[PDB]
Amino acid sequence: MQDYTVHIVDDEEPVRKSLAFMLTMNGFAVKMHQSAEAFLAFAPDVRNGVLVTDLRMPDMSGVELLRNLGDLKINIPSIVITGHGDVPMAVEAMKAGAVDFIEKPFEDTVIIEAIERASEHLV
Numbered sequence: 001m002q003d004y005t006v007h008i009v010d011d012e013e014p015v016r017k018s019l020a021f022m023l024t025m026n027g028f029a030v031k032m033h034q035s036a037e038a039f040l041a042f043a044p045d046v047r048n049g050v051l052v053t054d055l056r057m058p059d060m061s062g063v064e065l066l067r068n069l070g071d072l073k074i075n076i077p078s079i080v081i082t083g084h085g086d087v088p089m090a091v092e093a094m095k096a097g098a099v100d101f102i103e104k105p106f107e108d109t110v111i112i113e114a115i116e117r118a119s120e121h122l123v
């Protein structure tokens, strides 16, 4: 079986803990990051990891995070969670290299399938 880690980034702690807890209850190895900046500083050390990030985050957006990762010469399959009915954000996220976007609110089954898909990109 594959042993990958799901890295979660969200500006709202309650939403972050909700997702994290749900994925762990489903058997995924999960790591919650305090902010986009914290994940960016942790990124060089990631091995066999997938990223699930929120898009609208005041300090650093999900898109900007994706562009910074690219600058670090690092490729981490990413799923971007976008605001309800926010088309500009989903489009920009895909143009930025995200494996896929997920519109919230979302069904656990759906985010779980999106994560399994991103893991397809792990070498």
Ligand SMILES: [Mn+2]
Pocket (backbone or CB within 6 Å): 011, 012, 054, 055, 056, 057
């Ligand atoms: Mn947000």
